[PDB]
Each structure stands twice: as C-alpha cells, then as structure tokens.
C-alpha cells in the first residue's frame with residue numbers, strides 16, 4: 001500500500017564489482033512490453049495501467 | 050568475491066566422504082546446489098536443496114549422495130558413498146542470491162575430487 | 168613446433184589466476200610477526216567469535 005518510497009531506513013549491501021574500465025555517462029531502463037505494438041489493445045493490454 | 054569454498058579429499062572408489070561448502074557468513078538464499086564438472090563433457094548437475102525443504106537429485110546419482118543443510122553454520126554438506134570412477138571431477142557450490150528476483154550464483158568456488166584406486 | 172602463448176590480463180579486476188604467493192602454514196597462541204594480505208605487524212593470533 002505504498003506507491004512512493006516508504007518511510008524508513010535500510011542499509012545497502014555491496015552485491016558485485018565489475019571490472020569494466022570504460023567511461024559511463026548516460027543510462028537507460030529496459031521495460032517489458034506486455035501489449036503488442038502491431039495491434040495495440042484498447043486497454044488492459046499492458047500490465048495494470 | 051563475497052563467499053568462498055575449498056577443501057576436499059581424494060579417496061578410493063566405494064568410500065564415503067563429506068563435501069562441505071565452507072561457510073562465509075549468513076547469506077540470504079532459497080536454493081543450495083551441489084554441481085559437478087569434469088573435463089571433456091558438459092558441466093552437469095548433482096543435487097539441489099531448498100530452504101523450504103524441497104530436495105532434487107540428478108538421475109544418475111541415486112542412493113549415493115545425501116544432502117543436508119545446517120543453518121547455524123549455514124553450510125550445505127554432501128555425504129557421498131558407494132563411489133565409482135565416473136565421479137572424478139571438480140565440485141562447485143552454486144548459490145541462489147536474489148538479484149533482481151534471483152540469479153548470480155556464486156559457483157566460482159570449486160573443490161577438485163578424484164576417485165581412483167591408484 | 169608446439170607453440171603455446173599465455174596471455175595474462177593485468178587489468179583493474181579481482182585477480183583470478185594467482186596463488187604462487189605461497190603461504191606455508193600459520194601459528195596461533197604465540198606472539199609472531201604476521202603479514203596478512205599486506206597488513207604487516209606483530210601480535211598473538213587467536214580464534215575469534
């Protein structure tokens with residue numbers, strides 16, 4: 001029942017280091033397309049709006 | 050990095066010994082896996098234990114491996130008995146640590162175990 | 168001629184092919200000089216809970 005960040009504190013544990021060694025300046029997020037681009041539905045073809 | 054494992058003993062066929070993934074502390078998990086690989090063949094599966102209680106074994110290892118989980122020392126122990134020379138391999142412990150919803154097992158660590166009469 | 172080339176990657180990575188930095192054996196309950204992964208010093212080394 002929280003849409004935004006819930007109030008509280010939680011320490012972050014270090015999962016993994018990656019040996020890349022290149023510059024990074026811009027980033028992007030990849031989502032799952034639940035609907036169809038060729039024949040989009042009227043509604044609910046996505047995931048719960 | 051994080052976790053680690055080594056050890057193991059070289060024994061004659063038909064013996065019994067306890068492979069142990071040496072503990073690296075309390076880690077969140079739901080599935081512990083013992084897994085074996087030998088050169089010249091595809092890396093194969095040995096057995097998985099589940100924090101809930103599920104236990105799965107490979108088809109070729111019936112009646113010879115017993116898997117157990119110890120939550121105080123948080124280590125999985127495989128007791129192996131009635132050995133035949135097809136177990137000559139190196140054995141790895143793959144984790145389950147939830148990454149985005151599971152993944153990134155720590156099976157980097159290995160234990161070289163060869164069963165032989167000489 | 169059987170030609171074998173070993174290319175070693177000395178990059179900004181957690182080293183994986185290493186170990187000839189042999190360790191001999193360790194001693195406990197006795198005041199010794201210790202070099203622990205670069206931590207140099209002296210002391211008695213005991214089991215910790």
Ligand SMILES: *[C@@H]1O[C@H](CO)[C@@H](O)[C@H](O)[C@H]1NC(C)=O
Nearest residue numbers: 020021022023024025026179
């Ligand atoms: C990448 O970073 C290096 C600094 O190490 C800099 O010299 C170089 O110009 C950078 N290149 C780009 C494309 O950002």
